[PDB]
Structures are given as structure tokens and as C-alpha cells.
């Protein structure tokens, strides 16, 4: 609008279950940090540190509804909004062939 950006924000909860011989079918990207970044302030347009750089077309993540740009809010019921990249990677790996993730998709109107 005239006073600033309008956004559609869509929450998605998905449970991925894969073979040992395949990936979840995404690339994760975001801020590194030894412990959770307290100096980061989430905003509706950048609501979390980690997001999906890409999602493999037809892969596990794709089939469940995950898309490029989705921001990671929760991994296996733990909030990761202000959690550094390596810790989130370790949390994804902890479930093995099972990953429960809550994401927010941010689109311009």
C-alpha cells in the first residue's frame, strides 16, 4: 500500500518420511552462530534465521508442500527462529528419516 509493503504469510506444518538412500530434498541456508542470536529481531518479512534456499522438484519436501524461500520456525516441535545454522542442521539430523517442520511462506501482494 502507500504506507509500506503488503504480504501474504502462510504457515505450513509438514512431516517428511524418507528412505535412508534419499534426502529430504531441500537446501537450508541462514546465519551461523555458536548459540542462539539474541541480537536478531524477527519481522513478519524476515521471521527466522534459517530458510529453504531451494527445494528439489518432485522430492520429499516438494511433495509435502515445502517451497523455496520458506522460513523455518520449528524443527520437531522446537522453535528455531533465532537458532544458528549448525544447531538447526543438527536438530534436522536428530530425527533420522523423519522431520517435522513448521515454516512460514512470505509472498508480496
Amino acid at each position: 500500500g502507500p504506507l509500506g509493503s503488503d504480504y501474504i504469510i502462510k504457515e505450513k506444518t509438514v512431516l517428511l518420511q524418507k528412505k535412508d538412500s534419499e534426502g529430504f530434498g531441500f537446501v537450508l541456508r541462514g546465519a551461523k552462530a555458536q548459540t542462539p542470536i539474541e541480537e536478531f529481531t524477527p519481522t513478519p518479512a524476515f521471521p527466522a534465521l534459517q530458510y529453504l534456499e531451494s527445494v528439489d522438484e518432485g522430492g520429499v519436501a516438494w511433495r509435502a508442500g515445502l517451497r523455496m524461500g520458506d522460513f523455518l520456525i520449528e524443527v520437531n516441535g522446537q522453535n528455531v527462529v533465532k537458532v544458528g545454522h549448525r544447531q538447526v542442521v543438527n536438530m534436522i539430523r536428530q530425527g533420522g528419516n523423519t522431520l517435522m517442520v513448521k515454516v512460514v511462506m512470505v509472498t508480496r501482494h
Binding site: 534426502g23 529430504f24 549448525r86
Partner: peptide
């Protein structure tokens, strides 16, 4: 920032 692929196992 850092990237980690989960495209393969």
C-alpha cells in the same frame, strides 16, 4: 550465512 544440502542422504 551458511548453506547445507539435504538433497542426498
Amino acid at each position: 550465512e551458511e548453506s547445507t544440502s539435504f538433497q542426498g542422504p
